[PDB]
Amino acid sequence: DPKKVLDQAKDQMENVVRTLKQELEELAKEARKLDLTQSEKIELKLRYIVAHLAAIGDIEEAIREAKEEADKLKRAGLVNSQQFDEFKRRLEELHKEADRKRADYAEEFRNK
Amino acid sequence: DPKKVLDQAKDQMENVVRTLKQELEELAKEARKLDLTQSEKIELKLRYIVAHLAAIGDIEEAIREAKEEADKLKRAGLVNSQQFDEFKRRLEELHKEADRKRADYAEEFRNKL
């Protein structure tokens, strides 16, 4: 069901944004610790960069799995050309609106 | 102007959601203080409940006042029918976005406690 594929992706792309929020808040808590060695300060700064790449990457992997799942329904004959082009049209809308919500939290914790 | 009415509901709901945030943070800080009678803990529970019911109700009455604003522009034919459909679609997206943050703050407060 092409509708189920869009809903499956919006759950995953929201779950990635919530995972990003929790990882940035866990780093903000550890930035306040007064007993950070040299090993742990550089680790926290690089973990901040990875937290963003992992969000960008898991957003793309959610779009990729959704685009592959619709191609299977197309090749099976369960989806016509009118449903296919509609599905990519609304997938880009979910792709761009999740790309903003990720930038909204990233701008929120970058103001520290 | 239908876009103004959408943006009025956004700011009115972000204030509601911010007011819950400020209220819940204050309740979190006063919950940890030692020396609390069995009734003082109940008074905080009571202030929490009212804070919750105010957020739920005011989110609802912001959507309702926006719909009554839209139906008032339709009564005088100031809005096209194709617009009226588009306004309802973006209003409930503002509704889902506001209730998500509201339910987050209440859940974030329950975990910290």
Author numbering:
A (entry chain B): 170 to 281
B (entry chain A): 170 to 282
Would you copy out the relevant sentences from the publication that reported this structure?
BCL-2 protein family members BAK and BAX are the gatekeepers of mitochondrial apoptosis. Homooligomers of BAK and BAX form pores in the mitochondrial outer membrane (MOM) and release apoptotic factors into the cytosol, committing the cell to destruction. We use computational protein design to generate high affinity binders of BAK and BAX with greater than 100-fold specificity for their target. Both binders activate their targets when at low concentration, driving pore formation, but inhibit membrane permeabilization when in excess.
As a starting point for design, we used as a scaffold a de novo designed protein BINDI that binds with high affinity to BHRF1, a viral prosurvival BCL-2 homolog. BINDI has high stability (resistance to thermal and chemical denaturation) and therefore is likely to be tolerant of the mutations necessary to enable interaction with BAK and BAX, and we demonstrated previously that the three-helix structure of BINDI can be redesigned for altered BCL-2 family specificity. During the design and evolution of αBAK2, we generated two lower affinity constructs for BAK, αBAK1, and CDP02, which bound to BAK with Kd values of 7 and 60 nM respectively. Five rounds of FACS under specificity-enriching conditions yielded binders with high affinity and specificity. αBAK2 binds BAK with 400 ± 200 pM affinity and 333-fold specificity. αBAX2 binds BAX with 3 ± 2 nM affinity and 100-fold specificity. αBAK2 differs by 12 mutations (10%) from precursor αBAK1 and 22 mutations (19%) from BAK-CDP02. αBAX2 differs by 10 mutations (9%) from precursor αBAX1 and 18 mutations (15%) from BAX-CDP01. Crystal structures agree with the computational model and confirm the BH3-mimetic binding mode of αBAK2 with BAK.
